[PDB]
A = this chain, B = another copy of it.
Amino acid sequence: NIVGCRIQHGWKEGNGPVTQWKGTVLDQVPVNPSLYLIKYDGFDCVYGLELNKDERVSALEVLPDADTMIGKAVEHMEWRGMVLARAPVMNTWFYITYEKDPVLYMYQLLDDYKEGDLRIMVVDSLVGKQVEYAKEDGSKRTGMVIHQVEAKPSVYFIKFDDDFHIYVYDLV
């Protein structure tokens, strides 16, 4: 596992210039071990990538190395969203998603807290199960339930086949 490690690799999609990405691996998904969750330098969204299988990932390499809000609705500078958990590896960072963008973000939220930018206001775990959403056209969007938000167990992290973002949906 690279979990907790630091990585770097190129990102190449199309015959296009390779930008160089740097980030720290925070997770290797139990229900899918070839999928890792990464926090890259300069990105606010957490990325879900099958690092060793994605052909967009070039020359990968390894590198050199609160309990209150968790679960509460929130308004912060402005956006409304919910704090989900305390990001792994990077203990200071917080998993968070927003109502107008149901994807996984990661922020040092206590630092936003002090600048006062924080206004805190039946089925068992579905992790491991494939999920399908029927979209606009009469087509199915298929994904995998990879994590359950402990603070609020009705909420799950979903990795859809067509995207590297981690979606956060309420399946209840």
Please tell me which stretch of A63-71, A83-91, A112-120, A121-129 contacts chain B, meaning at least 4 of its Cβ atoms lie within 8 angstroms of it.
A121-129
Say yes or no for A150: interface residue by CB 8 A criterion.
no
- Of A20, A43, A44, A128, most buried by chain B (CB within 10 Å of CB) is A20
User: Which of chain A's residues 2-45 have a Cβ closer than 8 Å to chain B?
Assistant: 10, 16-21, 41-45
Residue from B42, B129, B132 within 8 A of A125 (CB atoms): B42
A45 to B114 CA separation, bound complex (whole angstroms): 44
| A10 cross-chain contacts in B, Cβ below 8 A | 132
| A133 cross-chain contacts in B, Cβ below 8 A | 16-18
Q: Are B17 and A129 in contact (CB under 8 A)?
A: no
Say yes or no for A49: interface residue by CB 8 A criterion.
no
| A158 cross-chain contacts in B, Cβ below 8 A | 17
